[PDB]
């Protein structure tokens, strides 16, 4: 049984932070992460803290495997974030395989990290990006895929969950349609891994990407999960130490995956700290924590909908609440709210095509996490009423 006050207590930033409603950009960190990091950079030169950090590090891929229900720790590849993970799939798996005229299907809801790499590899190979539009509930229209898929369709790129609408498409169906056409699927899990971590075996996901910093964890660290046969098929990514087996002026041979894909000194601090994040988080029932965050988002959305000119872009009672007010620019509101003590985000959220689809050039977004409270909702509503008085 989830206790919000127990979860909330682990977050040292909270007293200074005031009201923090921008977890969807980046999450606050629990003591476990701060302390694992402190310990790693302080570690006695040349045995009990030492061994604890060693077990955190060596167990780290396995803790990711357990989050995702990956078959084994060797399907987990360390990257610097979702962004590098997707570029790796595009460059190392897609680019050697794509032929001129092949098609890559990309949802209009995609964050730029799951869209720009595809534009780029399309331009390199003569493949074409084909748009997967939204249905009437603002989700990628998975039901339309059979009509969009052709004998040229090779890759489907689809967000598990939008960082704007919080909306999740019907990914099981989408993947079943893509696999039926012999396509591979790049799932962007940067939000989903935080809220509804994907069962990569049940969903039959080919590749899944997420970032540590959004999962209560360090910056500069992320994951690429891929099926072992796809990781084996991928070409090497960066060249250098660690990924290589033998090297001479005539050429080189590589380790197999995941090491093949990981040149140079790892982000050891980032691995250790994401290990601590995951170990800490595993003591909480994620369904229960997420229902709490969603219930606050709902309380905020119902209150704000009582104010004139409110519109919400929120899907599926998400813990993310994107919204705007008629005749008020999102910049002005975000500024006043910050002066009032409320931290949220405004602008395009790296999703310019989605926002163009919805007919807006920016929105405000308040995103709730399991350390947010009912008073945080009261404070946000109070600041919005004071801001709207100044702006309308």
């Amino acid at each position: 049984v989830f206790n919000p006050a127990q979860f909330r207590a682990q977050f040292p930033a909270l007293q200074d932070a005031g009201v923090y409603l921008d977890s969807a950009a980046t999450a606050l960190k629990p003591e476990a992460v701060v302390e694992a990091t402190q310990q790693f950079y302080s570690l006695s030169a040349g045995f009990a803290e030492a061994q604890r950090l060693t077990a955190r590090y060596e167990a780290a891929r396995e803790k990711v495997a357990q989050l995702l229900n990956a078959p084994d720790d060797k399907t987990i590849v360390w990257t610097r974030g979702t962004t590098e993970s997707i570029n790796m799939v595009a460059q190392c798996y897609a680019r050697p395989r794509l032929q001129p005229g092949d098609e890559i299907i990309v949802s209009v809801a995609e964050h730029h990290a799951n869209l720009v790499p595809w534009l780029m590899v399309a331009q390199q190979t003569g493949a074409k990006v084909v748009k997967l539009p939204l249905n009437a509930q603002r989700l990628p229209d998975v039901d339309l895929l059979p009509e969009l898929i052709t004998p040229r369709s090779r890759i489907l790129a689809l967000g598990q969950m939008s960082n704007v609408t919080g909306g999740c498409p019907d990914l099981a169906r989408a993947i079943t349609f893509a696999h039926s056409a012999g396509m591979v699927v790049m799932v962007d899990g940067a939000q989903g891994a935080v809220h509804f971590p994907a069962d990569v075996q049940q969903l039959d996901i080919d590749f899944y990407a997420f970032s540590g910093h959004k999962l209560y964890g360090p910056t500069g660290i992320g994951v690429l999960y891929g099926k072992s046969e796809l990781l084996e098929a991928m070409s090497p990514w960066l060249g250098g130490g660690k990924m290589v087996h033998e090297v001479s002026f005539d050429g080189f041979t590589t380790q197999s995956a995941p090491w093949k894909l990981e040149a140079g000194t790892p982000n050891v601090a980032g691995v250790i700290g994401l290990s601590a994040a995951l170990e800490w988080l595993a003591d909480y029932d994620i369904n229960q924590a997420e229902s709490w965050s969603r219930s606050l988002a709902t309380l905020a959305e119902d209150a704000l909908a009582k104010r004139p000119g409110f519109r919400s872009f929120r899907c599926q009672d998400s813990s993310l609440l994107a919204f705007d007010f008629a005749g008020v620019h999102h910049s002005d509101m975000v500024t006043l709210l910050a002066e009032y003590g409320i931290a949220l985000r405004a602008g395009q959220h790296c999703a310019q095509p989605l926002l163009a689809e919805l007919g807006v050039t920016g929105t405000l977004r308040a995103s709730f996490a399991p350390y947010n409270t009912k008073s945080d909702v009261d404070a946000l509503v109070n600041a919005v009423d004071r801001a709207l008085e100044l702006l309308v």
């Binding site: 910049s331 975000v334 500024t335 405004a346 602008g347």
Partner: protein, 145 residues
């Protein structure tokens, strides 16, 4: 003497005008309210006119700043902002630099009028990305002449 993307700042709206408006204001909220009012005197810049100014981008808000030298040998600045608060800050800035020579602009301390009007430390918008970029672009422009 008409100028491209004409505005009143530095001609009909002066540092003196602004001091009179702003000096009595001690509450931060009223300062934002008056910035919002002041920015209403900056004319909207149509899409077609924006593309002859530099886009000084940022996450939350688009701001444009462009410049030229007038027939009197003085610099003319013009621009726009989508957010109304930053539009008011832009008007303050235009008030400080309009009709100055490159030399006079290199002589002036960045954002000095904002400290004069009680805007800089007191409002976080004054210390934000949007306004610091704007300030840098003036410097860049004064050098480039």
């Amino acid at each position: 003497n008409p100028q491209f993307a004409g505005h009143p700042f530095g001609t009909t709206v002066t540092a003196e005008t602004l001091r009179n408006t702003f000096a009595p204001l001690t509450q931060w909220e009223d300062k934002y309210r008056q910035l919002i009012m002041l920015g209403k005197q900056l004319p909207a810049l149509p899409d077609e006119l924006k593309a002859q100014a530099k886009e000084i981008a940022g996450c939350e808000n688009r701001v444009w700043l462009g410049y030229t030298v007038a027939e009197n040998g003085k610099m003319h600045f013009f621009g726009d902002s989508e957010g109304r608060i930053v539009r008011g800050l832009l008007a303050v800035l235009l008030t400080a630099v309009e009709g100055k020579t490159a030399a006079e602009l290199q002589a002036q301390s960045p954002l000095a009028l904002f400290d004069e009007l009680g805007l800089r430390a007191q409002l976080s918008a004054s210390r934000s990305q949007g306004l610091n970029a704007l300030s840098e672009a003036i410097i860049a422009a004064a050098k480039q002449v």
